[PDB]
Ligand binder design. Structure first.
Ligand SMILES: CCCCCCCC/C=C\CCCCCCCC(=O)OC[C@H](O)CO
Ligand SMILES: CCCCC1CCN(CCCN2C(=O)CCc3ccccc32)CC1
Ligand SMILES: CCCCCCCC/C=C/CCCCCCCC(=O)O
Ligand SMILES: CCCCCCCC/C=C/CCCCCCCC(=O)O
Ligand SMILES: CCCCCCCC/C=C/CCCCCCCC(=O)O
Ligand SMILES: CCCCCCCC/C=C/CCCCCCCC(=O)O
Ligand SMILES: CCCCCCCC/C=C/CCCCCCCC(=O)O
Ligand SMILES: CCCCCCCC/C=C/CCCCCCCC(=O)O
Ligand SMILES: CCCCCCCC/C=C\CCCCCCCC(=O)O
Ligand SMILES: CCCCCCCC/C=C\CCCCCCCC(=O)O
Length: 446
């Protein structure tokens, strides 16, 4: 390698390492200095930043030395230890991406039962297990394969994993670390998006029909309430109501909350209502037989008159289960319910009749920062890791079709995931972008 080629590689790779270490330290410090970013799902983001910092500071720089020098010059022990660290960190990054996906999946699908289990303590446990599993999977095999086989067949000046002899063995690891995790995370995201779409529609339906209050008010029974009919306490005190509200949210609200915080309390109420319906012998067979649009209409009815109230419409419920919607509409309209709230009742009835959102003009699904960041980090993983994993796939069909130069570029592209991952958080999350800019401007002055 000529002197001009050595300088050019050192500059580009050096600047790449600097951008990787800076971005991941900015991600870690943002969570540390800003309390609003100290959420359970950001514990996994911090854990991912740690794996990416190892890639940026260690893997990128030791690989730059290996490229420039044209061989491994640090010995056999340093080779096995550097490979163990590189593969353990890369595998830990994938496991944190799986931890982000699964956490967001259970918090959107089950916001009541899972949120009782979703604590920093359990997050710290899952983070530690993801790091330990990654260590036990790679490090023993990398260090001790030579002793099992009886010879170290990796030549002096070379540095690669000996247990990955046949490309089919490498393909197995590619299936385990990329192909299967990607399929799982894409399936998870699909269910998350679908659940969010359905839950937002119920939120908008009840916002029109019941009403949304961002400040503490009193219900018909005189009890302190907030959002869309969310009971805070039955105690005749405002301080007791503020205490229950601060406990459920996680900040000093002082009686005033946001639409997003009200949507979070609403989704917990939806799960409690759906839990009731499935436990109710009169409401369970009709709910299971109904589509997502007509299910929301039933929940709306439950929110207004309760479980026993809706269950009292024996003939209407049976006709809805029989898919006789025009006939069910007749019985539901000839009730005390229709006489008390005719506008809300006719909108609910039309929904049962058509199975569409024609009674309300509904907006498209507003994708929150959480959902947006999830697809960004998942698309970033696929983008950067695809070239190397396709090269492994090519190798199984034809032995030496992939040249050494291409493996090197595939490895570099793979490392780029560590660089663009903090950029995804900055692009999708406003709170991250502002903290990043705050930390950088403070470092410049002074
Ligand atoms: C024939 C070759 C065998 C094929 C390999 C099959 C192994 C299945 C692995 C992951 C499934 C993805 C689901 C993710 C949940 C499991 C988390 C886990 O422990 O997987 C570790 C994985 O190696 C981290 O890359
Ligand atoms: C868990 C899934 C697999 C993830 C892959 C595994 C391969 N690495 C590139 C390894 C590059 N490399 C060398 O080729 C020689 C020695 C060396 C020392 C220190 C750092 C790097 C190297 C990118 C991610
Ligand atoms: C050197 C600065 C980095 C440039 C950015 C990366 C762009 C991709 C580079 C591809 C060119 C590498 C291929 C060179 C041919 C020599 C291959 C060989 O015979 O070993
Ligand atoms: C080379 C240096 C790179 C490391 C920089 C990252 C800074 C270290 C992070 C500190 C974490 C802040 C301490 C807060 C502990 C929270 C634990 C808890 O959940 O109770
Ligand atoms: C070589 C050194 C690297 C060590 C690898 C192990 C990484 C383990 C990850 C760290 C645990 C994450 C803790 C979460 C941060 C808490 C932030 C906060 O709420 O204040
Ligand atoms: C369940 C222990 C798995 C070991 C931790 C390693 C991290 C990678 C796995 C991610 C799954 C975490 C999701 C929480 C467990 C729910 C069980 C399930 O439905 O799969
Ligand atoms: C992944 C690490 C593998 C550990 C190998 C050690 C083998 C010996 C077996 C002992 C394991 C028993 C410890 C169980 C943990 C205590 C229960 C708990 O609180 O979770
Ligand atoms: C968070 C990381 C974001 C990733 C950044 C990638 C930005 C891609 C956009 C740059 C424009 C260059 C692509 C132009 C298309 C060329 C098409 C062609 O081949 O003719
Ligand atoms: C199994 C746990 C993983 C171990 C990770 C530690 C890896 C560190 C080793 C490699 C870097 C070598 C340090 C540079 C010194 C070279 C001096 C020389 O021998 O010429
Ligand atoms: C010198 C070795 C280089 C570092 C390699 C890192 C891999 C080792 C893995 C096992 C240690 C367990 C990880 C730490 C868990 C604590 C974090 C937490 O639980 O929040």
């Amino acid at each position: 390698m000529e002197t001009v080629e050595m300088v050019a590689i050192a500059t580009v790779a050096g600047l790449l390492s600097l951008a990787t270490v800076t971005g991941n330290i900015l991600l870690m410090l943002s969570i540390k200095v800003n309390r609003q970013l100290q959420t359970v799902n950001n514990y996994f983001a911090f854990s991912l930043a740690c794996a990416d910092l190892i890639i940026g500071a260690f893997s990128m720089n030791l690989y730059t030395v290996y490229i420039i020098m044209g061989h491994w010059a640090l010995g056999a022990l340093a080779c096995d230890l550097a490979l163990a660290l590189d593969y353990v960190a890369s595998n830990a990054a994938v496991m944190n991406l799986l931890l982000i996906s699964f956490d967001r999946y259970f918090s959107v699908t089950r916001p009541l039962s899972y949120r009782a289990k979703r604590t920093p303590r359990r997050a710290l446990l899952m983070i530690g297990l993801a790091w330990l599993v990654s260590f036990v999977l790679w490090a023993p095999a990398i260090l001790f394969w030579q002793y099992l086989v009886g010879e170290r067949t990796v030549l002096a000046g070379q540095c690669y994993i000996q247990f990955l002899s046949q490309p089919i063995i490498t393909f197995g690891t590619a299936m385990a670390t990329f192909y299967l995790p990607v399929t799982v995370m894409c399936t998870l995201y699909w269910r998350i998006y679908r659940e969010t779409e359905n839950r937002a529609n119920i939120f908008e339906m009840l916002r029109i029909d019941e009403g949304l209050r961002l400040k503490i008010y009193k219900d018909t029974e005189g009890y302190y309430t907030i959002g869309i009919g969310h009971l805070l306490t039955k105690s005749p005190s405002l301080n007791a109501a503020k205490s229950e509200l601060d406990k459920a949210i996680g900040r000093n609200t002082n009686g005033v909350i946001t639409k997003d915080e009200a949507e979070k309390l609403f989704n917990q109420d939806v799960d409690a209502a759906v839990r009731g319906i499935l436990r109710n012998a009169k409401l369970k067979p009709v709910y299971d037989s109904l589509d997502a649009v007509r299910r929301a209409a039933l929940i709306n009815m439950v929110f207004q008159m309760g479980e026993t109230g809706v269950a009292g419409f024996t003939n209407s419920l049976r006709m809805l289960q029989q898919k006789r919607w025009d006939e069910a509409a007749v019985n539901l309209a000839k009730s005390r319910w229709y006489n008390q709230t005719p506008n809300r009742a006719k909108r609910v009835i039309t929904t049962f009749r058509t199975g569409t959102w024609d009674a309300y003009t509904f907006s498209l699904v507003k994708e929150k920062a959480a959902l947006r960041t999830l697809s960004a980090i998942l698309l970033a993983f696929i983008l950067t890791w695809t070239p190397y994993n396709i090269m492994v796939l090519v190798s199984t069909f034809c032995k030496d079709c992939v040249p050494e130069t291409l493996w090197e570029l595939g490895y570099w592209l793979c490392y780029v995931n560590a660089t663009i991952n903090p950029m995804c958080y900055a692009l999708c999350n406003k709170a991250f972008r502002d903290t990043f800019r705050l930390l950088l401007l403070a470092r410049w002055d002074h």
